[model samples]
Target: ADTGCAIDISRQELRCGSGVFIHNDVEAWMDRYKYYPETPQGLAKIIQKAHKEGVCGLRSVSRLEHQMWEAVKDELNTLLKENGVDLSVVVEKQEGMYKSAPKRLTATTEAPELANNTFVVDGPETKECPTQNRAWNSLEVEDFGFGLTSTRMFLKVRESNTTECDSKIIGTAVKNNLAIHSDLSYWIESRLNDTWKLERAVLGEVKSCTWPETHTLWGDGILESDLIIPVTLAGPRSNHNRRPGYKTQNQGPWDEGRVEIDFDYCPGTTVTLSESCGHRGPATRTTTESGKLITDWCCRSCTLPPLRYQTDSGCWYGMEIRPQRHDEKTLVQSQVNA
Candidate 1:
């Protein structure tokens, strides 16, 4: 009605209360840019333009998937290793070749059919989805070199200093939302018009909860805040992650100890505690032949006893939070659907 700008679409002249056509007609202008703004800056610029022109417009979200490729060196190696190729390669080799040898061995042992199951060759081998299945099967077996079966399963606990403590640790699975995800484009358009905004609030009810240590795509383990840790294929302290040297019998009570973790959200009363995935020490506890102490570290693999303890299923949070399935299941399912 107030054509003083701010309408993305055009308009047709309608009779003004049955009045005769005024010689001076209403001038209507439409900015076609309202439908597309690919980058964040593009969207920002559009919004600025809209405000200046007092005109409504749209923006696109063609690149939200363009994540800031924060190369955590370890992740890069994992990617390269998992693929059997090196990201920093001096030579061109087959993907997952390095990863394949070990994988092929394990897959052939566990599910040999997974290795030889061939399909109709309609296109380039990699172009087909079945080939992807193979990458998964191979990686699965190689994933569990020292899984629970190795008698290396253990758990360690930690406590925060209550008297001088400020925050407690709380971890949770994030929810999947469509409003933000349907398309980065819609958000761009909305943001361009100042109708959309960013708000990353903590989800669910929990302790002085901060996001998982490895949750952020960038950023550090927040000392005090409700953080939504992004789920990834892996995290710190992996069974597939560690460099071995853990003992099987007295596997561990090692590095994972009573370290203070703060959960800023739910202050007081609670600290981080997980009854799964930790180290065990060696079996022997003998004196150092008249010496004060002697401790020997074991060269054993570990067992991570979380929800989806499979060495094969692609890493998903559903596996970690398995114990709280009633609560965690719905959350993960929502993320999958999202």
Candidate 2:
């Protein structure tokens, strides 16, 4: 099973387990190519040696063949480069290299002559705002690539009066303001350093709407009625599943009672599901409607078989659905709760 071939120095020939002869032409080619520079110069010099030397049989021959192949390959590339021809380009154009051969042009195409006519065109004119004390309001609807659309409203306040007191008033209006209107509305309010800006108040009311159930009245030295408005437009809406509210009381001899309503707007839970596909590939996103938002991801480049045909991209996918908050601080707090 371990039989191999080697050069027989004493017999002046190549031999396997039985016996073999080295051809004159093959030996001459090997010498000319310097295939076995480590071996004795010629068969005559090897035969003249008195001591019997061992060789690594076919292993030595295989190594020499590899060296010769590398030498020929490098020389061929060098000659092609010297002749101003790229071997890579030639190989690229070989048959079966691509799906199809490029089309060749039969004749040269002529260019059309350009006309020398001249004409004057008016440039766009810049116009300033007609009213100096006007504010610009904008409502922007954005898609955040999460399979849902986010609508935002902005009011740019530009007061012509630049006095210190006027500036303070403008800042207050910009920071704390609420206006209800048809089609578009703006509700900018803050509590405990967290500002909640609601633009789609109609949708908020429709999705998650709740009304106060209880009302109280206080009768002391001064009569005060703590009447809670049953209107649905009191605070920020869109709180799903979780009930968020706070209360505060006043302490004094008069024992004045204060009713505070602090509800966590848009309170929700987060859910995430992850998967791994072995290979990198293109990703696709999809959304499904439910009481909670659902975003489905599929990366098609993975080679693995899909659990279902509809999601056959064979790539890793992550499904994450979390609560959205209008305020940055409130969003952080929601994430912390998760």
Candidate 3:
């Protein structure tokens, strides 16, 4: 039997598709580029004004910005496509070469045990890739033949299988934080210091207009549209578990996203359907209508803070968990009855 939990969410309305058209950055762009010239008079005036000046530097910057996004569009879509692909390759690691270092999580610990901070590479990573540590899962890269300039960058190695990987997803959660993954099957992530705990794993499908297929949010030339996929909550059975003391390498534009996964439930169980974004900046996530979550992400209009940082990129978004059987409020009815 699979060691994790499973959820089932049905037809849900998505207010915002992956928070693409939303976000302070996108809003700001609309204000500067599209909104001001929306009216006939305003549009005519701007065209005349800019025409008189030959070409506005601002407009040039905007055009260049769109041009630069070509790389990012391919990067993100490749990541999603690769992650969603079947985990067929086996990455083998030496037994006991690496030990599990699950930190006892707390705001301030008396003697906080330092966690093994390794960087997970979401692209075609070399075998020397530091973040490929999966002690509990017993996995390692078998080859680094493919360079980062190709389609998907998953490891082709010799160890474990989807069965083993899925089991540990839900089986390895501890404390209030939950171990989660996305329908894209990207890497896993943890929500630290959660105020509430999910007693039961929820199952559902995500419906959104910003399906990763259209590449329009970043002006990759396609209009953003709708997509729906199945999702679940995962927590693995603890087998020498610890809080993921994971940190990622932030290479803006060029930085491939990272993953931190651990499921403890059965084969059908999954949670926190995470898109392999975060460590670099505004961690990418899946969301529903009017829902948004941000990590260290920034905007793309400019390579400034909130837009860019020394070791961070901008923020991103995706689908949010759809509460089907019992909404969050309904699940809390136990205390109201008391």
Candidate 4:
């Protein structure tokens, strides 16, 4: 009952981005006061070396970097723990925000003396925080949430039990994965021009793949179906498959990942599974194993120029699709294919 065509993944991808941005302008202090190493190179080296990915700068206190991280890592973990989340499964989008403020503190001028001196660090100020958007999936794993979410920041708003919000993940797709879920449900095969391609499932094993010779792939025993699957993209010689576009977002594509509901199927009692190509991206963006699950996506979409058909987030990049069977079985022999 959905209304769309097959997926076309032959075109170029819109690219994604991943990276983190930390605070560099913040004033560094050595034990509240005393030895103030005054030199650009001094501070630069400290920061350069202290950066998580690379040494950013230094005032001769690179050792403090790990110390500072330890100091704040707890608070960070606490915040996430309170929200019931993990930083290992899904890549988190830490559009790290920043704000700057000039600080003035009164401290003892003499290291051994108790006398206090008044010093204005940079003057009270407020500025925007810049965070590195490293694409992170390790964090997404084990830690997943459902509902209408905000991708700008790693926040998952659980769907309400009311009509306003919805829950219950619909497809093989997990919530907020290295891949996205923005349009996976609602938008399928209306009309878009790109080379349609199909990716294999998260299939872990095939022993069970043969269990249900004719059932839906989601049915019965599907070994390693959860993952550990060999890449199943169609070869250049592979044929196209298409299905009737789904009218609603909830009906099909739920039990399996490869097959699509063609909106324009032939008039027959049996729904024909045929080859089709060229549709749209599954979610707001595309996904892959990519880099560290914690890094923000910085693939071709985020790092390139071909975005004529991609989402603003560069999510739709070269997304492709094909159909298998409801029982999670691929069409084979006698050209009895999908």
Candidate 5:
């Protein structure tokens, strides 16, 4: 039996080894073992494997080994840059309130519940979980209104002059992983043929309200306006309800709505942010309207995370390749087990 470093998952009694069901009642399992990273080379190999394999989530290993893998991560980061993995950190400056009716809607009117059935409550007690049902949904929907104060964040994509170009785009927003909010979609101003086509990459065919829209590589379509994104939430809630649009002094998490983007390409592909909808338009468009223009791929109501320490799910340490939507059944099953 290939025990998980001495920790095994028993089918009849699935435990932490399963990395799934983490019931608070811990008297049910056997655990404990010392992981030796005495072999620096061995540890480096594991670190390198993660980067090479383009693993997006955290690569599980002993805590002892993680601390020592710093050098490898640096090398990997450098390697990524050298290999056309361009990354840029963009910070939000304006406050989140809409000039017209920004503060008008709160959780009750604007944002709504994500999964009608499942919930992640504080502690191991699902009972203690507040019945946060039927609340305000995504603030994003409101910001879509054409208003001066109601600004939204935009993601810009540009292509390198190359044939058969395949580029990957990864976007992460600063916000409470406890709840998902930002909505992403892109506009294509490029012509598919004789017709001057203006199109979008949506969860499904346009006009279908049932499908949530998306621009992420993951085919998850329009995301739940309240579901925490993968890798971003894996930890604690620190934002304390502070919104990103509010004015800030470039403080730590205040700009928590700060976005970090990553991608893999040669010299041709590029990604950048317009900060707000008002700031968007031709400024961020690098190539051309006909150069496979996909603009306004944006996020709405992006909230920042915890201030001081890192609460990002420890799973996403190294960079990952672009994304593919997780299958609904497997995704649901993983959540159920977790």
Candidate 6:
């Protein structure tokens, strides 16, 4: 007898759609300078000061954004050249910023949780899979600007001296990569016919043809070889992916990215000033009348790092002043002073 109880197959399925999502936690880390100048003149002045102070190394975020700074440097170089300055700015090393791809979570189904009382009576069924019929066709229309077809008309002066005879116009129209309108062809032929009689003209049908390496046009009895005429065909003209009346303007000042200046020419120790030191000035130490207490803070003759003239904006703009090798006496004095 067939038992009424039978195993039933059921599924609780979830199908997730594919998409590209931007998470709120995603961040683009960029540095911002505090006292960086906005104008090219101001930047040039800073660079000049750095050079005069014997700065050997200068660094930025990377060449990606460094191109902007390079323009400034170029302007500075021009200014220096006009002023008869002998020094020039040069890049020592370049390091690019790197980023990783976003993480991916693949969709998959987990094993079904069967009841404890369920028993496997019959084996799991297996059969031939159905054949998949995948027939797909796609058409894409790309908007390329007006097709420019070039026509080379070879003209030769007739050797005959007949009054009714004129110069023979021999030419071939090459088919452009983009489709050209038929009316355009008629327009070109009509214009050519009005100017000069067309002899051996292949204008009825555009064909793929190679231009002669050298062809001459006679003007005032002078042969102008290799005459090439660029003809724009009439068709759908593309806007070149730009809005109408679009005009470019200068980029605003950057609020991100770091700048580092190295004082390599002048090698000395970095002497941080204490709270008790007097007003900040050049890298020279001044002692009191008693010679017992040092009043002024000395920075070992190296270029003092520029102060953060503006308020902090949580961006890193480091001015690294690397100490170079100096005499042993100076090193010992610097160590003792520190």
Each prediction's number of clashing residue pairs: 32, 2, 75, 119, 26, 3
lDDT of 1: 0.19
Instruction: Please provide, for model 2 over 165-277, each residue's C-alpha lDDT reduced to its tens digit, 9 standing for 90 to 100.
Output: 11111111121133221111111222222332222212111100122111111112321111111112222212111111111101100100111122212122222223442
In the range 92-177, model 1's lDDT, one tens digit per residue, is 11211111100010111100111121211112234332232321111100111233322111111112211110111112111221
Q: Which stretches of candidate 6 lie over 4 Å from their true place?
A: 1-37, 63-65, 92-338
Q: How much lDDT does candidate 5 score?
A: 0.20
Q: Write the per-residue lDDT of candidate 3 for residues 5-77, one digit (tens) a residue.
A: 3231332332322311111222122222111111222222332232233321110011212222232334333
Error of 1 at 280 (Å): 18
Over the stretch 130-228, how does candidate 6's per-residue lDDT look in tens digits? 111100000011112232342222212222222110111112121211111111111121112222211111122111111222221112332221111
Root mean square deviation (Cα) for candidate 4: 23.2
Q: What lDDT does each candidate get?
A: 0.19, 0.19, 0.22, 0.20, 0.20, 0.22
Q: Give the TM-score of candidate 2.
A: 0.13
Q: List candidate 2 stretches off by more than 4 Å.
A: 1-185, 193-338
How does candidate 5 fare on TM-score?
Answer: 0.16
Where's the lowest-lDDT run of ten residues in candidate 3?
223-232
lDDT of 5 by residue, 21-77 (tens): 112111212212122223333323333343233321221111111222332344443
- As for model 6, its CA RMSD to the true structure in angstroms is 36.5
Better of 2 and 5 by TM-score: 5
TM-score of each: 0.14, 0.13, 0.16, 0.16, 0.16, 0.19
At residue 156, give the lDDT of candidate 6: 20
